[PDB]
Every structure is written in C-alpha cells, then in structure tokens.
Design a protein around this ligand. Structure first.
Ligand SMILES: C=C1CO[C@@H]2[C@@H](C)O[C@@H](OC[C@@]34C[C@@H]5[C@H](C)[C@H](Cl)C[C@H]5[C@@]5(C=O)C[C@@H]3C=C(C(C)C)[C@@]45C(=O)O)C[C@@H]12
Ligand SMILES: Nc1nc2c(ncn2[C@@H]2O[C@H](COP(=O)(O)OP(=O)(O)O)[C@@H](O)[C@H]2O)c(=O)[nH]1
Length: 828
C-alpha cells in the first residue's frame, strides 16, 4: 500500500505518543479478517527497498495514518504531529482460553471488538473481551454486517436502531463488570464516537462523529452538541423546527429520532433506490448527498452500484482509523496504568517505574510474547514489546526465563542479541534499535527462551508477569525393539538419550519394560524420535506401558484347604486370611523386618500391631523374595518330621507369592496358616520334589477359597493452575475414577494446587486431556501412592477387574479361564 524506508520507520517509532499497540477481538465468524484486511489495503505499510529467500509466519502488521489538524485536537491525550503508526497484532481466534490469547494481548493497549448486527454479542466475544479487560485493554466497538439486516431482513429503521441499542448495552455490561475501578468509565458511547457501524464485506462504515461533522459545517453548528443529539432520545420536529427531550409532540403524537432521521435515512434511501433500479431518483439522491461517481461507474446497477456509491459515501477504513487514533491509548498513556500489573516486582522499584514513564533511557525491559516460526532453517524469532530502555543489535542482555529469580541463578542466560528486526507480517527488516513503546522481533534467542520470557539490562531486575511450566516427567510410554537382535542398541541408545536431555527420564517398569518419560507430549515426541533414528537408530514399537497388579484375598477361606503330594503319602491343611494394610505397609517400609532380631521384631508386632504375641514367633517366612508383605504362620501341633519339611514349605511359598494363581502377579497382604501336616515315616518320600508342589498347590487352593481380588496401582497427582481452570481438573478427573484429596491455595497470588489420586490404568492420555479441559492452564506431576483392591470378582471375565485379568492372560498366552480352586484341592 504505502512504502517506507527503514529510517522512515524509525522516525515513526520515535514519536511513541503517536503509536497505537492494538488488535482485533472477535467471534468465530464476524468479519474479523475482511475487516482488518480492509484496513491493511488502506494503511498497510510495506518495505521500501525491493534458490534463496526468507519468510516468517505473520504475527503483526503495521498501518500508517495522517489526521486533520482539527482531528488531532480532539485527541484527549499527549500527541506530537499529524502522523500515526498503528500496530495490528494478530490474536488467536480459535485456540483454547488462556495461554495463546493472554500472552498476545499483553503487548496491546487497546482493542477493536467486532460484534454482529443480528447475532449481537456471543459467548466467545464476551470471553475474549473479558480477557482483554483483565489486562486493562480499552475497548472500542464496531457492529458489523449491517448489510444483512438491510437486505435479507428488510428491517425498519427504528427496528435496526433498537438492535444497535441492545448490542451496545450488553457490551457495556461486560465492560463495567470486569473493568478496574481505578481505570474509570471505559464504557463505550456511540454519541462519544467510540462505536462504529458498517459492513466489512461491503466496505463501508461510519461513526456518529463523522456525521456530526458533515452536518456541523453545512448548517453551521458545533458538533459537540450535534453528536449528543444524533443518538438516543433527542428528536427534531420538522414543524416546530426545534429539538425535544421527549418522544411525543405536544399533541401526543410520536416523532422520529435523530439517529434515524439524519443517519439511517440517507442510507436507507440509497439501498431502496439503487436496489430497485429506480434509474431516475438515483442521480438526484446522489447529487443531494454529494456522492460523485466517475466514468463507467455511472452505468452500474443493483449490488454493483450499492458498493461503489456506499464505499465512496462512508469508507469503512476511515471510521476504524478514527476510533483507533482518537480513543485507543498509546504506550505512553497505557504504560502508566498498566505498569504495576505487568511487573512482578516492587511497584516503586527502579524498573517498574521506567515502564510507567515509558522511558527509553532506563534499563532494558523487553517482554517476549511468543516465538515465531521462520524459513531460516528451524530457527524461531522472538516477538515482543520494548517496555523500557531500548534494544540494540548485538546488545548484551540478561535473558530471564519463567522460573528465574533475581538472586538465584536459575533460567538466567547472559548471552547477546544477534539482530533486532521489524516483523512486517510475512517479512522482516533489520534495524539498529527500537526504543521503549514499540513492537519488534529478535533473532538469536531461540535456544535460551522456549516461549514467554523477559529480557533485562538491569541486574536488580524482576520478571514480568510470567507463565508457569510443567517440568516433571509425566508423559511416558513403553519402548521395545522390533528385531530382538537390536536390543543391545536400544539399551545403548537409552543412555545416550538421557545423557543429552536433562529433562527426559528412562527406567524399567515393574513389569520389565524399558520406559521413556517426558515433560509434555511434544517433548516425548522429539525424544522417541531421536531415540529411534539417532540415539538407538533401530526400529522400535512404542506403546502404552503395562501396569502391574497385586493378587490379594478378601477374607478367611470359606473352608479348609487340602492337598496331597504326588506320593499320595503326605498331606497339607491350611487356610488363608487377610493381613492388615497398616501392617503390609510396615513390612514394605521395613519397620517389620525379617532380618531384624526376633527380639525387636516380636515386640513391634505385639506391642504395636495387635498381632497375638505367640504368632510373632511362628512365622516361617515373609514373601515373595524372602521379605514381602505375606506370611506363613505355623499353627500345626503334632507333626513328627515338621522341622523336616520346613525348608521346602518355604521355597514353595516364595514361589506361590511371586506369581499368584489369578494371573501370576505378586501377592500382597496374604497370611497363610498351616493348620496341620501329615508326613510319611521315611524321609525318602517327603523330599523336595514331593512337598514343594504340595504346598504350592495347597496355598493356591486356600487363596482362591479366600474371596480373591486384585489391587491396582494408584498415582498421587499434584496440579498448579489459575482459579478459573480448577474446573477442568474435576472435569477430567471424574472421567477416570479420580479423587480429589486436598485443594490448597498458595498465598500471594492466584494459583491453586490440586491434589488427587489417579488410577494408574486410567492415566494414559491424562496429560493431554488436561490441557484441553483447562485450555493449557494446568501442569501435572505424578507419583506412585498406593495399592487399592478392586471390588469386582477377578474370575468373572465381564467384571471390571475380570476384564483386566482376561486381557492379561491373552497377552501371555495362558488359558482365558482362571483355574478355580478345585484344580488344586485334593479331596480325602
Ligand atoms: C510420572 C512419573 C515421573 O517419573 C516417575 C517414575 C520415577 O516412577 C513412576 O511410577 C511408576 C510405577 C511405580 C510403581 C511401584 C514401583 C509399585 Cl511396585 C508399582 C509400580 C507401577 C506399576 O504398575 C505403578 C506406577 C506406574 C508404573 C508403570 C505403568 C510405568 C509403575 C512401574 O511399573 O514402575 C511414575 C513416574
Ligand atoms: N454480508 C456480509 N458478510 C460478511 C461481512 N463480514 C464478513 N462476512 C462474511 O462472513 C464470513 C466470515 O468472515 P471472516 O471475515 O472470514 O470471519 P472471521 O472468522 O471473523 O475472520 C465470510 O463468508 C464473509 O464474506 C459483512 O460485513 N457483511
């Protein structure tokens, strides 16, 4: 549109009182693009001077505009000259709530909210506006698609007005409701020229002020008052030739409002005449309004003409530009009431002040809004705003991350800025510097600032409103080699991955699978990628990690269990019953140890865990692995060669409990009581290969008679997030048998710390699903917490648990049926 040299741009960048950092806030289909596009063609700036080339993803655009000596006097705000530099920063239309959006606005001071003439203000509209308000962004309105109502609906004039009327009122509800008391009445007033009406597709729009001036010069009145009248309850009676503050002429008759008589009328008459082909009235009407056509335009018809005559009548572009310049704040103005909020430090601090003043001579205070993709071979550029001091190419800056703390040296990076550039839509342009108050990009920060961050030149500097990260590994899957022979390389490469990525984690699952875990899904992504193509460079099959379970019993076996050796000579009679959870834990945590003296040990189980004191000294072993939470207590009476079979009964128990009868999982909280034992006179028939199997079977039998169940692992998740999104937590948690434990708020500033239990086998995907429910606001952090017995029957293929088992057996190539106890029991 207009081309400027790089110097010209720096000159404009010097008068920051004539700059406007804004964006366009709008609903999903309200003309946000046809409208900004309209502006761009009118005022868009372009690079002056104009296999190999460079490009960046559009993130901002620059518009230039000159005003009239008079229009610059209505600017109730420190100005400097007839010129202006508008910054049209792009914002995410459809992206989740608070992350992509919040960050973008933060570098804007004003907004241009687009509302629809028919649908009025919808949810999203009200949502982003509330968002913008939160950061104290002043709103200015534009009701769009006024053409739909004029054609399709055929609406009246007072009908339409009333619409505009409402739409304005709702917006003013949201305004007052979320506006900082200290900022004053930011409510939009059509009569004050802060609300524009028009059609972005047709190309026309208008503010009341534009009409209040048209009529102001001709008939000789000051517009101050002509504006107040041209909207609301002010009527002008042709007859009385005077105005009134009541909608009824003395005689009791209804009059026509000004807005309708002086604004809408002219318009309506033009539609109706050109849209009905009244080739005789068009000429006289156009003449009357002072709309001159040129050349072949004189012979247009219908829609073709409505657009020409309408765009000449009220160029959408000038209405928008008006409001922008005359009502939206400049940095100098906004950075004064927006300084505290954007600074996380002392509101009296040296820097926090250089923001308010928007002083380019203070200590650098540049905020990075986001990292933008570019054709420069995988390099990203930093897009942000210079809030204080000034940036320079090759400058030495202190890059502070989201965790950085003034004292502590974490997230801090004392590197230098390669180049400072202009982000002109899809193109960039190098410059020498950029003072406080502007929008610029930075090349060479890539690797030190992932996303949001603050750049400073002061060592006693604080960070600007920062965004929190997820830094614990949580996203994990099971990695395995496709050709068994590559195993050595998979292993080889897992130590390679770890040695390079300090934010990755690798380990062996209880169920023997190698495991890769990472920060986010994107992180795991890059990780598994490199692993298979460089670290290990071997084909791998990635999958959800297999969960381990615990086979346990619910009560004392309904009946005694019997089992005879394959000698038909020796028999064993036992029963199984549950061990208490507080106890099982004690065994697990080593408070009750099989290696500790019977002295200390006997004491603890009697004097601290209710165990009958005699019991303590008749346990033969804990298991599996000699020290697990399962006991074999000897309750026999007159077995001659008892002490003779002990060593065997033990090795049998250490086997049974390592791989239970349900599906081979480890048993937990299982206490086996041997009620009696009968042996053969000779030791030649009570050997190992005779007793071991007897006990193995015997135990299984008692076990299944004891109302079997299974225990599932359970995580203990911790979450941090803003008060509003604490809803998503409970939202998703419910869809996964979750359970909120505690909800504590960190004193100081909003950020809740939700804590809950999460069934390990309901956690695949959780991290992602969380991002959604909270629009990228919360970040999880898991850890194993405990075992929990499932209520359902493990031998009923259809029950919850029973499905868990079933699939398991199929995965192992075992029978789908779980051999009931009868299979192990040997009746007398
Ligand atoms: C989310 C994270 C981040 O890093 C942590 C790592 C260190 O520990 C992880 O905790 C991993 C656990 C730890 C416990 C206990 C050892 C008892 Cl025996 C039962 C096991 C589990 C088995 O079902 C239950 C948990 C989820 C698993 C696999 C599905 C991978 C487990 C495993 O096999 O290691 C949680 C991870
Ligand atoms: N009649 C009419 N259609 C419009 C107007 N503004 C936008 N549209 C149409 O609405 C649709 C969506 O508009 P667009 O600007 O892409 O919406 P966005 O999603 O807000 O960017 C398109 O088909 C446009 O042609 C307008 O003022 N009048």
């Amino acid at each position: 549109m207009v081309a400027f040299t790089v110097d010209q741009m720096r000159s404009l960048m010097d008068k920051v009182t004539n700059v406007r950092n804004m964006s366009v806030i709008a609903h999903v289909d309200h003309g946000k693009s046809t409208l900004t596009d309209s502006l761009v063609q009118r005022a868009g700036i372009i690079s002056a001077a104009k296999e190999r080339g460079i490009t960046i993803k559009s993130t901002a655009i620059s518009l230039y505009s000159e005003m009239s000596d008079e229009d610059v006097k209505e600017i109730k705000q420190k100005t400097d000259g007839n010129s202006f530099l508008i910054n049209l920063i792009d914002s995410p239309g459809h992206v989740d709530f608070s992350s992509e959006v919040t960050a973008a606005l933060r570098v804007t001071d004003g907004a241009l909210v687009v509302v629809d003439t028919i649908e009025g203000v919808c949810v999203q509209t009200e949502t982003v506006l509330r968002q913008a308000l939160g950061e104290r962004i002043k709103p200015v309105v534009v009701i769009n698609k006024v053409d739909r109502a004029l054609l399709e609906l055929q609406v009246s004039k007072e009908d339409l007005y009333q619409t505009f009327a409402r739409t304005v009122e709702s917006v003013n509800v949201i305004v007052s409701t979320y506006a900082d008391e200290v900022l004053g009445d930011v409510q939009v007033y059509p009569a004050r020229g802060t609300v524009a009406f028009g059609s972005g597709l047709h190309g026309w729009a208008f503010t009341i002020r534009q009409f209040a001036t048209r009529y102001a010069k001709k008939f000789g009145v000051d517009k101050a008052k002509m504006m107040d009248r041209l909207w609301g309850d002010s009527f002008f009676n042709p007859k009385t030739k005077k105005w009134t503050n009541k909608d009824t002429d003395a005689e009791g008759k209804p009059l026509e409002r000004a807005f309708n008589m002086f604004i809408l009328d002219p318009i309506f008459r033009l539609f109706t005449a050109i849209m009905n082909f009244k080739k005789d009235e068009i000429p006289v009407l156009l003449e009357k309004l002072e709309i001159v056509l040129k050349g072949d335009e004189k012979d247009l018809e219908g829609k073709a003409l409505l657009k020409v005559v309408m765009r000449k009548f009220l160029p959408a572009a000038d209405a928008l530009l008006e409001m922008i310049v005359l009502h939206l704040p400049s940095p100098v103005t906004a950075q004064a009431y927006r300084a505290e909020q954007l600074y996380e430090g002392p509101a009296d601090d040296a820097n926090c002040i250089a923001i308010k003043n928007c002083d380019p001579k203070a200590d650098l205070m540049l905020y990075v809004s986001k990292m933008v993709p570019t054709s420069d071979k995988g390099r990203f550029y930093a897009f942000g705003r210079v809030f204080a001091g000034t940036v320079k190419s090759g400058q030495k800056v202190r890059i502070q991350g989201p965790n950085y703390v003034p004292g502590k040296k974490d997230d801090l990076f004392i590197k230098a800025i390669q180049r400072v550039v202009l982000m002109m839509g899809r193109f960039v342009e190098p410059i020498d510097d950029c003072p406080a108050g502007n929008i610029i990009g930075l090349v060479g920060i890539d690797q030190f600032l992932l996303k949001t961050g603050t750049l400073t030149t002061s060592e006693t500097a604080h960070n600007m409103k920062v965004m929190k990260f997820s830094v614990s590994p949580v996203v994990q899957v099971a990695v395995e080699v496709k050709n068994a022979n590559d195993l050595p390389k998979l292993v080889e490469g897992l130590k390679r991955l770890s040695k390079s990525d300090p934010c990755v984690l690798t380990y062996m699952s209880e169920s023997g699978e190698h495991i890769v875990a990472g920060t986010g899904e994107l992180h795991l992504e890059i990780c598994l990628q490199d692993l298979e193509h460089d670290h290990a460079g071997v084909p791998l099959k990635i999958s959800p990690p297999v969960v381990a379970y615990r086979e346990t019993v619910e009560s004392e076996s309904s009946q005694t269990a019997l089992s005879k050796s394959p000698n038909k000579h020796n028999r064993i009679y036992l029963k199984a019953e549950p061990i208490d959870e507080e106890v099982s834990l004690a065994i697990e945590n080593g408070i009750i140890n099989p290696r500790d003296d019977f002295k200390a040990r006997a004491r603890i189980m009697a004097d601290d865990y209710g165990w009958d004191v005699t019991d303590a000294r008749k346990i033969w072993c804990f298991g599996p692995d000699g020290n697990g939470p399962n006991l074999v207590i000897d309750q026999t009476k007159a077995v001659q060669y008892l002490h003779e079979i002990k060593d065997s009964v033990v090795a049998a128990f250490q086997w049974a409990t390592k791989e239970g009868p349900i599906f081979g999982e480890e048993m937990r909280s299982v206490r086996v009581n041997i009620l009696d034992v009968t042996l053969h006179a000779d030791a030649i028939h009570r050997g190992g290969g005779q007793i071991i199997p007897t006990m193995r079977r015997a135990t299984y039998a008692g076990f299944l008679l004891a109302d079997p169940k299974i225990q599932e692992p359970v995580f203990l998740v911790e979450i941090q997030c803003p008060e509003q999104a604490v809803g998503g937590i409970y939202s998703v948690l419910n869809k996964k048998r979750g359970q909120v434990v505690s909800e504590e708020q960190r004193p100081g500033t909003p950020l809740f710390t939700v804590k809950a239990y999460l069934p390990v086998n309901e956690s695949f995907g959780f991290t992602g699903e969380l991002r959604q429910a909270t629009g990228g606001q919360a970040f999880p952090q898991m850890v194993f917490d405990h075992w929990s017995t499932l209520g359902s029957d493990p031998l009923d293929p259809t029950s919850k648990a029973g499905e868990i088992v079933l699939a398991a057996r199929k995965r192992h190539g075992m029978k789908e049926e779980v051999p009931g106890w009868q299979e192990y029991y040997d009746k007398l």
